[model samples]
Target: NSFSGYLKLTDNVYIKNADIVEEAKKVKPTVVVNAANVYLKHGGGVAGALNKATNNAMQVESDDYIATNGPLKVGGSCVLSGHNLAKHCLHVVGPNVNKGEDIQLLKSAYENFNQHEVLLAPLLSAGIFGADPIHSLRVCVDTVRTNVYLAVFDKNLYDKLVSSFLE
Candidate 1:
């Protein structure tokens, strides 16, 4: 199926504008990356959407998973399964780049995806938490050397992302 605002990154990687949950159901990717908090709270933004989509089961699983594994740090991830969407959901805690010294933290989070394949991630460090879209998307494009599907919810933001790729 063809999607608007789709930007091809690598031979397999693509940035597409679509509702994350809808796309997840259709694609059933191997991994879906969540823009999570250090505590892995499924309260707001992309994290909230993913939680709602999975009926908050991910939150319950994540809470216990972190309780045993410790807090999810910047660039660190926790994997979960048995969800209705992807085979595995990867919760990645990215930093709020508005805070000093946190830009690097956000950068680190994107870099962690270098080893994975078929990863679905949102525009991290953006949205409510606040980060330059250009900067954030650039980091994502540069670091994730795999089959990456970027979910863009806003049209303007989607255009900017595509423009960046074109440039």
Candidate 2:
């Protein structure tokens, strides 16, 4: 597996990337964090992929809830349960690279995921959103508290994650 390397945050927590869904299938995480928009739209990146995997059920649940209590702000998150693949899904409105730098917001997304045994998270704000990979990885590493599996699919970004740990 090219997703061979990982940064061990703790004995149970690991940060890794490359084919995130492939890794998630192996472990079957209890909670998968969706890097969603303010409207809780699970449209792209891991959110979209997971939505497709679950037959759009994740989005349906997210939409229903957010319809009443949205638009979620950056750093805000909520959970949707009883989903396929994972028991729960956390819809987090992560920092938008197109907007501006706010590592605190990205960190808050991880903070909102407290009390989980196992979590599947994606690198927030680092892909189509255009945030710097190193910064995104740094915030994720710093904020995550549970046993986490972070899927970072980009090779260059993954390499930077490895380097972040080294430094």
Candidate 3:
């Protein structure tokens, strides 16, 4: 893989086909993004892993947020305490296919992460949320500030990102 693995999208952001968990440890990011639902169930892949790793703190905090402020709306985001590799997890709700894969909503979620530094992230809305991978990649690169590590699990997907990440 040229340039190691990730295709650096900007001075502050890069995309790679790797697990965010290990990468987060390596980078020791200030915050990490979760591909979360509006309800913040923390069940699926990355969500589940982080929750289990952190003693389900995410779930409990999410429940508190839901109870206090109500469920997060599509494109809405919240930050919570994190353990292990990072100190904070930024939960961003993306558009689901069953409801509406609205591009704007996903973009909003990605943009919100700009507020946090050295953020680690998965491809939000690109898999379970059903947004286009290209769209997800583009939106995140176009948005998000500070240092970012973008994790993609598939080699094929990595290839696509490499091609699309034109300088």
Candidate 4:
């Protein structure tokens, strides 16, 4: 839990280098953000970890959501009730840069998630989405509307996030 960043003490945001699922036990954010695909499937990467941590409730809810609302588009977001891990989970889809997408779409993803007093989120687009870690952090820091708990898995990226948070 040796994490820090700009505006962290005043509780605007926090960034850390650690396992998101494991550290979430101690951090206890009011809500969690699922870095998901457009289909809202919690299959791999941060999505898988969140599904594993919250149980099948997230998947079940997402299934119903797509059936009722259609598959979410890129840069879209939806909220659901996920058991065990947190009271609610916000599912957001980032742009896949390998597919000729760009930063604006990724920034839109961050912009789409609803603000909360305390939200635990990952660096969207940094994993399977094929975007740089700092790129994800930059838009998130700029777009986020409330307090945040940014869970970063890589130590190097953690340094980058903290450094960029300062700048």
Candidates in order have lDDT scores of 0.78, 0.72, 0.78, 0.75
lDDT of 1 by residue, 8-103 (tens): 876756887787777777777788888888788889888888889999898899889878988877767767773987888877777775554377
What does candidate 1 score on TM? Answer: 0.90
What is the C-alpha RMSD, rounded to one decimal, of candidate 1? Answer: 2.3
* TM-scores of the models, in the order given: 0.90, 0.84, 0.87, 0.86
What tens-digit string does per-residue lDDT give for candidate 2 at 39-152? Answer: 867677777887877788877887889788868778887778736666777777778867774756777766776768677778777777777777876676667766677777
What local lDDT does model 2 show for residue 116? 81
**Lowest summed lDDT window (length 10), candidate 3:** 1-10
Off by over 4 Å in 2: 1-13
Best by TM-score: 1
Q: What digit string (tens of lDDT, one per residue) describes model 4 on residues 1-167?
A: 22334236234656777777765666555677888887887888888887887666678888988999998888888878746666677888888887877668887788765456667778888876789877777677678777777777888877767786677
Q: In each prediction, how many residue pairs overlap at the backbone (N, C-alpha, C within less than 3 A)? A: 0, 1, 0, 0
Flag regions of model 1 displaced more than 4 Å. Answer: 1-5, 99-101
How many clashes in candidate 2?
1
**What is the full ranking by lDDT, best candidate first?**
3, 1, 4, 2
